[PDB]
Each structure stands twice: as structure tokens, then as C-alpha cells.
């Protein structure tokens, strides 16, 4: 289950 | 931000002159992912070389498996030539039947 990232770096 | 790749050249099955087999070129510990690997026969580039998909291990470095069909003989020499940005010149490693 691919995780979906939060705020960009 | 480079890493100099390690190379191992070996057959999939124990060699037997005349018996078809698969020759391997396992490249590891390199970065960035772009790289050019060539497999040679008596100094000539082998056109039909399969390449595993790009993977990287826990220390961020990448590894790949290049292989091709070959039929060892008493006379033919096989080698792997790796072209990567972390080296100012390509590195060539020969297939050694005893390794």
C-alpha cells in the first residue's frame, strides 16, 4: 500500500 | 556526490564448454543510478544484454544485474565493462571460470 507523502521538502 | 561501483562477473550455472548458459555482471554500490554496462566477447560488444530493473539498498546505493546468453568454449574470453560518472574512465572485469 503506497504511502502518500505530506508537505514537500 | 559519487560512489565507485563494485563488479562481479560470473556464470549462472557451472561452466561446461559447449553447453549454453547465462553470463552475469552484477554491479553494486553506485550513485547516481544512471550507468552504462557493456558485456564483451573477445573485445566485442554483445548486442543482446538483458538488464534487471533499478533497485537501491538501505545505504542509498544502487545495484543492477546485467546478463546475456553465452556458450563457454576453451578459447573465447568474456568481460564486463562499466561506464559510470563516478569514474573518469570505464572499468572492465573479465569472466574467470574459476570464480
Amino acid at each position: 500500500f503506497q504511502p502518500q507523502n505530506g508537505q514537500f521538502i | 556526490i559519487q560512489k565507485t561501483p563494485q563488479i562481479q562477473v560470473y556464470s549462472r550455472h557451472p561452466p561446461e564448454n559447449g553447453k549454453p548458459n547465462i553470463l552475469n555482471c552484477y554491479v553494486t554500490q553506485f550513485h547516481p543510478p544512471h550507468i552504462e554496462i557493456q558485456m564483451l566477447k573477445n573485445g566485442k560488444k554483445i548486442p543482446k544484454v538483458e538488464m534487471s530493473d533499478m533497485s537501491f539498498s538501505k545505504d542509498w546505493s544502487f545495484y543492477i544485474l546485467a546478463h546475456t546468453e553465452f556458450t563457454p568454449t576453451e578459447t573465447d574470453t568474456y568481460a564486463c565493462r562499466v561506464k559510470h560518472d563516478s569514474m573518469a574512465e570505464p572499468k572492465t572485469v573479465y569472466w574467470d571460470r574459476d570464480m
Binding site: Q2, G6, F8, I9 | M54, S55, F56, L65, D85, D98
Partner: protein
């Protein structure tokens, strides 16, 4: 003692052509799913026979998330360009590793979430799942940015939730498969060298998983003294090989034994040179 990880990579290339994004999933260190933006029709693809079970819905959902990830790396990749003062026309790499480990009890034991840029640690989420460990100055900008926005909480939820729910699921589907083994088949070869002295090499082929132990002994004594040992290597068919050798005094050859230890063997192996 199971786990699941997603190893993601985004590499920028010379020009105004969007970077290539590659994402690979693992269960107990075995690749089970893969996505590549270079491919013809980019979609998430099965990579272990036990994943073909999932219907269309699953692959569609996964494919979308991955397309979002690709965009996220596109953006993040530009910001890094600034952080480090790099011209907009070079070669760069941003990588991420995320996942969870389950303990004996199958409960979350630890979650992971780290990034690297140009091959080096950039910022990692700590075991507490709330505080960050930036690797350098540049990374501080990002850490400050993420603290000042509760970015940690977002991952914590995934790591203790979906990560765990789906790992349990995948483990159920690929139960016996994942927990399989192929014993190694060994043999010893003899090779000349030094005047008198000679080389004996013990081979282990066709085994899975890659974990294995090769030992050499002289008169029942661990000869951990000058033994040649290559890194374990993939054969290409999904099995592995590894070999160890020693330089021995000619004639005194049959005075040495090779012992092979592997998780798939009913019992360890012992073998000697056989002229």
C-alpha cells in the same frame, strides 16, 4: 519479524523533461510491486505471483497514489535545487524509504521514513514518530518547515495504520510462498597457484534466501585465517550463489573440509575435495 518497505527514487535529467520516478515495494525484503514513470502506460505492476490476487480497483488506486508521489518528488526536487544552489539543468537524485516492522506479536515494532538527496541522508523521522533528525544545515530548512506544520503526524498515522493493515494482508496472501527455501548445492573445485601451495574453493549454488554461511576447517578447527570470500550474488533465476576458498599445501588437500549452513537444509553440509 516481518516488514514492508517502499523504496522511491526520482532522478532529474538534463533539459526541461520531467524527472523519472520509480517506486518499488518490499515484503520481508522481497520485491512484490513496482511502478515506473518511463514505462509505456505507467501503472503499478505485480512483482510476486501472490499479488495477482488483487482486483482492478487495487491497482488503479495504487497507480494514482504513485502519480501523486511523482508530482510530490517533482516539486520537492525543485526546492532542493534552491537549498543547495544548483542550476536548473543538472542531474539530481531524491530517494525515500518508508515502512514498518512488526515484532513477534505482529504489532508495530517500529516505523520508518527517511530521505536522501544526492546519495546522502537528508532528513529522517525518529522512532518516536514526531521529531526529526536532519543530517545537515540545508536539511534544517525542511525540518523547521515540517515541525511548523505537524508533518510528522501525517506519517505516524500511515505507519501505525495502513502500513500495518496491509502488511498483515500481504502476509496472508503470500503466506507459504514468502516463507520458502531452496537448499544450496555445494561442490569443491581445485586450482593451482604457488609452488607447492594450491587453492580449494567451496561453492554454494541455487539457494534462497541469500543468507548463508561458508566455513573452512583444518583438523576440526575453524580456519578463519586467510579465507577468500565473495559477496553473495544473484544467479538470475531467483536463487543465489557464494563461495569461499583457502590456499592449501599440495597433498595435504584432503585435510580440509567445507561446511555449509543454510536455513533450507535439513542438516548442515560437510564436503571435501574429491579428485
Amino acid at each position: 519479524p516481518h516488514s514492508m518497505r517502499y523504496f522511491e527514487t526520482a532522478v532529474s535529467r538534463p533539459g526541461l523533461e520531467e524527472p523519472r520516478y520509480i517506486s518499488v515495494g518490499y515484503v520481508d525484503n522481497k520485491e512484490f510491486v513496482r511502478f515506473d514513470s518511463d514505462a509505456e502506460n505507467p501503472r503499478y505492476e505485480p512483482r510476486a505471483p501472490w499479488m495477482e490476487q488483487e482486483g482492478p480497483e487495487y491497482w488503479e488506486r495504487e497507480t494514482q497514489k504513485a502519480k501523486g508521489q511523482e508530482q510530490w518528488f517533482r516539486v520537492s526536487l525543485r526546492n532542493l535545487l534552491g537549498y543547495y544552489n544548483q542550476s536548473a539543468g543538472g542531474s539530481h537524485t531524491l530517494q525515500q524509504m518508508s515502512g514498518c516492522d512488526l515484532g513477534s506479536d505482529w504489532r508495530l515494532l517500529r516505523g520508518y521514513l527517511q530521505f536522501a538527496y544526492e546519495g546522502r541522508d537528508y532528513i529522517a523521522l525518529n522512532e518516536d514518530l514526531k521529531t526529526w533528525t536532519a543530517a545537515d544545515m540545508a536539511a534544517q530548512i525542511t525540518r523547521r518547515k515540517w515541525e511548523q506544520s505537524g508533518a510528522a503526524e501525517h506519517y505516524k498515522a500511515y505507519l501505525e495504520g495502513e502500513c500495518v493493515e496491509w502488511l498483515h494482508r500481504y502476509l496472508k496472501n503470500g503466506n507459504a510462498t514468502l516463507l520458502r527455501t531452496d537448499s544450496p548445492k555445494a561442490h569443491v573445485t581445485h586450482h593451482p597457484r604457488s609452488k607447492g601451495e594450491v587453492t580449494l574453493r567451496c561453492w554454494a549454488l541455487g539457494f534462497y534466501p541469500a543468507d548463508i554461511t561458508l566455513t573452512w576447517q583444518l583438523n576440526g578447527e575453524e580456519l578463519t585465517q586467510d579465507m577468500e570470500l565473495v559477496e553473495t550474488r544473484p544467479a538470475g533465476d531467483g536463487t543465489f550463489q557464494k563461495w569461499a576458498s583457502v590456499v592449501v599445501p599440495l597433498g595435504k588437500e584432503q585435510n580440509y573440509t567445507c561446511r555449509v549452513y543454510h536455513e533450507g537444509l535439513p542438516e548442515p553440509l560437510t564436503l571435501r575435495w574429491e579428485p
